[PDB]
Structures are given as C-alpha cells and as structure tokens.
Design a protein around this ligand. Sequence first.
Ligand SMILES: *[C@@H]1O[C@H](CO)[C@@H](O[C@@H]2O[C@H](CO)[C@@H](O[C@@H]3O[C@H](CO)[C@@H](O)[C@H](O)[C@@H]3O)[C@H](O)[C@H]2NC(C)=O)[C@H](O)[C@H]1NC(C)=O
Ligand SMILES: *[C@@H]1O[C@H](CO)[C@@H](O[C@@H]2O[C@H](CO)[C@@H](O)[C@H](O)[C@H]2NC(C)=O)[C@H](O)[C@H]1NC(C)=O
Ligand code: NAG
Ligand code: NAG
Lengths: 51, 152
Amino acid sequence: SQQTVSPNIGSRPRVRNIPSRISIYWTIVKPGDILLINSTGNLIAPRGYFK
Amino acid sequence: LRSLVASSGTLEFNNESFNWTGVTQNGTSSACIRRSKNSFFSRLNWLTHLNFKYPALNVTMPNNEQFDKLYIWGVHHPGTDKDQIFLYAQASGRITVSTKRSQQTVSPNIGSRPRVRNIPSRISIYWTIVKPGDILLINSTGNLIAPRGYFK
Ligand SMILES: *[C@@H]1O[C@H](CO)[C@@H](O[C@@H]2O[C@H](CO)[C@@H](O[C@@H]3O[C@H](CO)[C@@H](O)[C@H](O)[C@@H]3O)[C@H](O)[C@H]2NC(C)=O)[C@H](O)[C@H]1NC(C)=O
Ligand SMILES: *[C@@H]1O[C@H](CO)[C@@H](O[C@@H]2O[C@H](CO)[C@@H](O)[C@H](O)[C@H]2NC(C)=O)[C@H](O)[C@H]1NC(C)=O
Ligand SMILES: *[C@@H]1O[C@H](CO)[C@@H](O)[C@H](O)[C@H]1NC(C)=O
Ligand SMILES: *[C@@H]1O[C@H](CO)[C@@H](O)[C@H](O)[C@H]1NC(C)=O
C-alpha cells in the first residue's frame, strides 16, 4: 500500500481555542513488509506499533 | 445526497445572508434559461471576481437553530484557462468548507471535458451538515459555487 496526504493550511472553527487540526491515518504492515515514511513537514509520526 | 433529501421529505429552504464583499454575486449562464433570460441554479450563488480581484474569502455561518442545517455548494471546473481568468481573474485555489467536526477541501481542475449542452466545463456538487452547536466556515480564492442558505 501507499498513502499520500497533503497538509492543508487554513483556519477552521476554533476547538479548545485551536483553529488547527490533526487528521489521523493508519497503516497495517504485514510480517514480510517494511514501513516507509517520507515527509518534508507537518507529519505526526508514530512512536511504535500496536498488536 | 439523493436518499438523504428523499428520506427528509422536504425541500424547505431558508435563505441566509453571507458576507460576499470583494466578489461579484449572481453569476449566470446561457445553459440555465429562466423566463427567457440567462440564469443559474435558484439555490446556488455563482461568485465572480470584483474589479479584476478575488480576495481570499473567510465567510462564517453559525447554527443557533437547535436543528441540523443541510448546505449545498459546488466547485466550478472551467474548461479553458482563459475562462478561469474571465471569471475569477486569477488561478484556482483549493475551496475549503469546514466546521468544528468536519472539513472538505476540493481543488478546481481546469480542463475541457466532453461538451454537455455545449458546455465543456462542469460543477461538482458537495454538501455539509452543520449541527446546532457548530459554525459553517467557507474559504475560497475562486471557483466556488456558494450556497444561498440552508435546507431543513
Ligand atoms: C476566518 O474566520 C474566523 C471566524 O470568523 C476567524 O478566525 C478566528 O476566529 C476566532 C473566532 O472564531 C477569533 O477568536 C478571537 O480570538 C481571541 C484570542 O485572540 C479569543 O479570546 C476569542 O475567541 C476571539 O473571538 C480569531 O481572532 C480569528 N482569527 C484571526 C487570526 O483573526 C477570522 O475571522 C478568520 N481567520 C483568518 C486567519 O483570517
Ligand atoms: C484561505 O485559504 C487560503 C488558501 O487556499 C489561504 O491563503 C494563503 O494566503 C497567504 C497570503 O495571504 C499566503 O500564505 C498564501 O498565498 C496562502 N497559503 C497557502 C497555503 O496557499 C488564506 O490564508 C485563507 N484565509 C484567508 C482569510 O486568507
Ligand atoms: C465583510 O467582510 C469584510 C472583509 O472582506 C469586512 O471588512 C467587513 O467588516 C464585513 N462586513 C460585514 C457587514 O460583515
Ligand atoms: C443576488 O440576487 C439575489 C436575488 O436573486 C439577491 O438576494 C442578492 O442580494 C443579489 N446579490 C447582490 C450582490 O445584490
């Protein structure tokens, strides 16, 4: 698989006084496979994996 | 959308006043003929440039009605680049309509498509539901087919 997401700069209705947001995404990596992250900014990187 | 409207069982529309300063309202087409004169969709506003300038819009519409509001808007995909300048006076800029809960970003795609009623252009229709607490936020730098109000 491949997931490309473009950061969208723009103010949205303030939530807990924050006009910004974080869109959450998920990826499942199969026993054979390798996780590949490419970013030039705006990424909210993982700290590890879940069972 | 077809079933969302059908199940609702009403076409009851309440007009709303949006701040459209810096842009020309009520854009019309020869495709849409109403009473022998050029017109457009009755429930949609075709925003054009004002004195060759399209300011980056940031129009707000809050819900204080203790009921959900259905909003219909579009994105105009001009056939030619010349049109784009004719209508909006500048290059396309991703139309973004958001709330406290959701966000919809749509990028205008300039390109000719098979002519329909001699029109190589199109309008892609989108919808947003604003909950009683929430606020409707529209950001556009051109190509937006703005609402005229909400539906019950
Ligand atoms: C785009 O529209 C929104 C909504 O009209 C505005 O952005 C921000 O809107 C909030 C209210 O929704 C403003 O909040 C104000 O901030 C103070 C703290 O400084 C806070 O105590 C209050 O909640 C107060 O109402 C906020 O100022 C405003 N942001 C900016 C930069 O003006 C604004 O009209 C538009 N935003 C942009 C970036 O143009
Ligand atoms: C509305 O959204 C646009 C993006 O579609 C924002 O445009 C930015 O404008 C500033 C200059 O005013 C520049 O940083 C860029 O030209 C734009 N940024 C990007 C990422 O394209 C705009 O700020 C938004 N809101 C308002 C009120 O302008
Ligand atoms: C409408 O928007 C302009 C900015 O484009 C702002 O200066 C003006 O105060 C607004 N007018 C109303 C009536 O909200
Ligand atoms: C657009 O036309 C409608 C009536 O068809 C009117 O309510 C609206 O104010 C017009 N826009 C301007 C800028 O006058």
